[PDB]
Amino acid sequence: MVFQRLLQEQNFTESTRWLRYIWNPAGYSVQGEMQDYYWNVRPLEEDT
Amino acid sequence: LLLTNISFMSFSEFRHRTSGTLTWRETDFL
């Protein structure tokens, strides 16, 4: 909802951050090291 | 490897550099 509402107001550099909170094709960095997943929402990794 | 070289590399690069002799508290401190 925050992502879509930031697209609709064309605040792009924050809209992309709020999309990084779910999906990042450039991986995720936890404690300095890159992780093995790309979905920051665990019922999207496991089909729950 | 001096203290100016460590600032250019990331923490993952620097931790892979010293993963044997240091143990992630001296690594993060340095």
Side-chain angles (χ1 to χ4, degrees):
Chain A
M1 178 177 282
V2 171
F3 165 73
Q4 182 63 41
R5 189 56 185 162
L6 288 171
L7 275 182
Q8 290 171 355
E9 302 301 325
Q10 298 179 359
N11 291 318
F12 296 118
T13 185
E14 294 294 326
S15 182
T16 183
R17 286 182 64 252
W18 281 90
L19 188 141
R20 297 300 179 89
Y21 286 151
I22 168 176
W23 186 51
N24 193 2
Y28 287 97
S29 177
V30 174
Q31 295 179 358
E33 61 182 359
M34 287 295 170
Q35 296 298 110
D36 294 333
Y37 60 93
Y38 297 96
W39 291 92
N40 204 2
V41 181
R42 63 177 292 270
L44 296 177
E45 297 181 357
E46 292 88 4
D47 290 330
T48 300
Chain B
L1 189 143
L2 296 175
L3 286 173
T4 59
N5 291 318
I6 301 167
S7 62
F8 310 131
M9 62 186 74
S10 70
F11 183 75
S12 183
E13 302 184 4
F14 179 64
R15 179 58 183 166
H16 289 92
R17 183 66 60 87
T18 184
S19 180
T21 179
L22 273 66
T23 175
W24 185 72
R25 184 177 176 87
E26 291 88 3
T27 301
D28 186 73
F29 178 73
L30 200 63

